[PDB]
Design a binder for this molecule. Structure first.
Ligand SMILES: Nc1ccn([C@@H]2O[C@H](COP(=O)(O)O)[C@@H](O)[C@H]2O)c(=O)n1
Ligand SMILES: Nc1ccn([C@@H]2O[C@H](COP(=O)(O)O)[C@@H](O)[C@H]2O)c(=O)n1
Lengths: 229, 225
């Protein structure tokens, strides 16, 4: 429906309501991270859906297969539209994740989309080699992980706009590229512009403070659309 | 108590039913993803109100700052123990510690925090062929445990077999929380687990699904000597 995903990086419903007030009537595609979901629970999701928003539950499930499977059934029942997991959890876990989603989804209905985190954006090549003990290049490791997720039946991954192109060449154009780290050309304090993100292949872009901290949220949301188009 | 009871139930209703017999017995219980994602922080407050210690097993694995704000949140919900994936890196694990601190009142210690080195369901094939980790599983587990040790965490989740080896690497006081526990009738035996060096043993269906939970808990204590 929309390429923009708004990250609700707040610790409570109250702050969430404050941000969304001006967006009344303009259904959004919002991302609920750990901070928010662990302090508000499934209640926050029912709330966002009542308002007519699409919800991306960014909890990055990474546990044993069965546990993930059971957790996904619940996440599908709560009403999530998109969820993710760590490819590092293995192919078996990722397949289980899909099994849980279908299990928690009514017949004749589409299960929530499920994408995989390959390597976190905060993970540099050094950390990859010295801490994680993965001797292979960061770029190829990402490509490998994406392929694994693709092999598991997942719909895509979380990647930088700069990784979208090669990930799609290896996994196919339909393989979703959900990319965070978005900033307008004139802000911030590892980043790309909405237009540039689109040119690179991103299907969805996660926007946070560039919108949640704007003086004029509505005009800024419009700017997002204009640049992207 | 060295026993941690895995509350692997669908909702609060099943949890209440199971705990009733234990009214006169403080327990150290584990709340995983399935239950927590279904009940929310409310399940924690409840358990605490019943005089139980709580291990919120969510295995957080995300960027540093997100894990920090998340832990600030888990400390305020009342959790006594939490965990993270060592795969997240030293910075992330250190941030978890910061989060717990900023989330703790002052009249008490920050909730403790342990790291998952490699999931108990990860074998060497998965590790090498899928995760691309070019080193033995056993050596990789010690490495990850060391990363957690160096990050300032209190311990790790590991099999009772890796317990001794991990402590030799990170210190005898470095905690060893061990899952996969089963009665004679993975390879477990509560007593065997204790002989291997486990500090806490996570017991699951072997107890929660037993015909007589309370009595199975008494047997757990006995085999533990
Ligand atoms: N260093 C960072 C900071 C934020 N992010 C992601 O993008 C979102 C926040 O973006 P700004 O608001 O982009 O901070 C978060 O919800 C997070 O998942 C990331 O991937 N790497
Ligand atoms: N293969 C397995 C089976 C159980 N477990 C852990 O122990 C608990 C279940 O214990 P039984 O039901 O003790 O297996 C779960 O909460 C889980 O975290 C594990 O880590 N790997």
């Amino acid at each position: 429906h929309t390429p923009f995903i708004v990250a609700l990086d707040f610790p409570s419903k109250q702050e969430v309501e404050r941000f969304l007030r001006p967006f009344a009537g303009t259904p959004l595609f919002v991302k609920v991270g750990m901070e928010l979901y662990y302090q508000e629970g499934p209640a926050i999701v029912a709330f966002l859906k009542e308002q007519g928003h699409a919800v991306f539950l960014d909890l990055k499930l990474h546990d044993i297969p069965n546990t993930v499977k059971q957790a996904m059934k619940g996440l599908a029942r709560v009403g999530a539209d998109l969820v993710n997991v760590h490819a590092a959890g293995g192919r078996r876990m990722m397949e289980a994740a899909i099994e849980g989603l279908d299990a928690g989804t009514p017949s004749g209905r589409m299960r929530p989309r499920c994408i995989a985190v390959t390597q976190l954006t905060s993970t540099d090549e050094r950390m990859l080699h010295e801490e994680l003990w993965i001797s292979r290049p960061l770029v190829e490791t990402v490509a490998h992980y994406a392929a694994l997720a693709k092999e598991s039946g997942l719909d895509g991954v979380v990647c930088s706009a700069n990784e979208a192109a090669f990930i799609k060449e290896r996994c196919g154009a339909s393989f979703l590229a959900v990319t965070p780290g978005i900033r307008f050309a004139d802000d911030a304090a590892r980043v790309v512009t909405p237009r540039k993100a689109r040119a690179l292949g991103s299907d969805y872009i996660v926007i946070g403070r560039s919108l949640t901290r704007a003086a004029d949220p509505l005009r800024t949301y419009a700017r997002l659309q204009h640049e992207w188009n």
